[PDB]
Design a protein around this ligand. Sequence first.
Ligand code: CA
Ligand code: CA
Lengths: 22, 543, 161
Amino acid sequence: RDSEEEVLRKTAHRVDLIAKYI
Amino acid sequence: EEGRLLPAFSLHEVSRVLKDFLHDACRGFYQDWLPDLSRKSEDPWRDLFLWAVLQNRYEMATYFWAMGREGVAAALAACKIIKEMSHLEKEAEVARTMREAKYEQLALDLFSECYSNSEDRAFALLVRRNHSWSRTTCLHLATEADAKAFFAHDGVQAFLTKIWWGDMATGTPILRLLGAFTCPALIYTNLISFSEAAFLLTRWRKFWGAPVTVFLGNVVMYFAFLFLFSYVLLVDFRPPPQGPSGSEVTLYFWVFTLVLEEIRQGFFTDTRLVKKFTLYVEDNWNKCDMVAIFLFIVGVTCRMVPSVFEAGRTVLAIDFMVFTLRLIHIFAIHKQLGPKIIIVERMMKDVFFFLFFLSVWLVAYGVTTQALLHPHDGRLEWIFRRVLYRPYLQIFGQIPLDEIDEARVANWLVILLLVTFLLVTNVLLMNLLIAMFSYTFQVVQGNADMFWKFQRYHLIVEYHGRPALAPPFILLSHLSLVLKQVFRHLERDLPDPVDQKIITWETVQKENFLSTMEKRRRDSEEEVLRKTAHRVDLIAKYI
Amino acid sequence: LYVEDNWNKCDMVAIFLFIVGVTCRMVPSVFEAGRTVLAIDFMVFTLRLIHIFAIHKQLGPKIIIVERMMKDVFFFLFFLSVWLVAYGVTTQALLHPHDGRLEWIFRRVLYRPYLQIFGQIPLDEIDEARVANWLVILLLVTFLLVTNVLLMNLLIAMFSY
Ligand SMILES: [Ca+2]
Ligand SMILES: [Ca+2]
């Protein structure tokens, strides 16, 4: 869960969702 | 339970076990068999730190150390205690974590920080008497802890060097030093900077008090003694009734002076005599010196007994070898030479392994070959001589085919076996020596290089304790010291005011160090990422 | 500037040797010694030749490597002498306790370690059966092991480094 890669991917996904919503 | 000769133990047992772990540093703890409980302890933080480090709880021990004064002394005794409680660990798995305590790292990290600013204060810190740990200096505590990595620090070496030159220029050409040493007139002039008829006497004392000068003097005197002994052994040796001479007497008196100096070095440098004797046994060089003087004493008996004229002489010859080996110790000081001696000393597997590897093949080969060549030999000693000489001589080009080759007085088998030997031992010896030498070397590149520094420190302290007079002249300094005692440096510490400022300054340094460590922790890429992710998640949930 | 370089100094030593040697033709009696000086001068010039090699891409780095390795001379001269002189003293003490010549003892004690390395072992003067043995064998084994591993190895670790 704490793989830097996993953190990055989750972050990117959330940013994209926030962007599409906003 | 042994002292008898909810749990039953009390603070008395804690004090006793702390004494068992550290003799001089912390013996007095909880003297006043217990004290009134109503009384608060004189210094709490140290007690809590000890309690933490005993129960083997790191991340609390660090915290207790943080808000405790006089820290660089603590974080070293703590390493001593944990490293000690390794042979006392019942379970191996646990024994590993505590063996990974690395408390010493705090000592190094703090010492570096304080060394960075105001070094003239750092040295004062390094050898100040310690108020809490039963008034012992940091260096003694490092010795007892056997923290080599601490000695490896640059500040330690700088301080050691400052002591090494007495009161003189730190750096001075070796040739300029030799010139200042050989001719006292050059001393009066300012060949090299000198730290600050009476003026001439003080300059003379400043020159002869510096350790390096005593070192060189002992060197040259030892050379002198070795040469006189060699001359006596070479030509003076003569039949016991009419064989010793005045020169032999002078040599014997010289040896008496040497052994007296060694006893002084061993015993009068240490509460009990057994303790000092153990300290003396500790080092190897002291033991070699003991073997040397024992050999000399037993050899001296030769002059007394006519018949044993030759054997005792041989003993003396061996004693010469012994002294020649003694000479090696001197080399430790030099930056280049030392590491080589460290490397060759570390490589001690070769003796055992190779003695086996050579013997198992040589003895069997000799038995088989002597079985082939001459099946009728009735002499055990002659067979011993032959079977010893053959492998001893075949390596160095001495191959007597006049006794092995029927055409020159089974051959091809002997040739095949000798080829197998000269190949497998060849590749096997130098190669193993060398892989291990590199690795042993490489091991030495780190750990034995640290030892070299360790060895340097030991030598420095040893020469500091010596008086100016040489081995043959010690007969006056030891006598004068004994007379003064019968008639009647590092240890020195400051006053309340002066010291307190130092303590406070060190405290501030420790605080700055910790704040810096925290700041560096703040900028970890991991920390930035985590904070970013948290903020994004919060923003997402809110939006 | 001229003193700076080493090769200039070697050239100076060479011409000094030649100048002093040329005096041989003048003095009849010193006919041989000056000739020997000239012989040494030849060695000097032969060493001078090495400088030339610097240009070549391959050769040069080898000369650089051998020149950088100057610890060996001092360390090994000590390491050989300390053992050789003591060994010779002890062995000559054992074999012949009555030697009255300093120069003869010098010749013997010099020749023995100089020749034992290269297969010249005159047992006719060391072995009573061929005119204390086992001690000499043990010491020679200890030497031929510790100097062997110690020399090439140290040369080589340092050579690599
Ligand atoms: Ca000693
Ligand atoms: Ca030129």
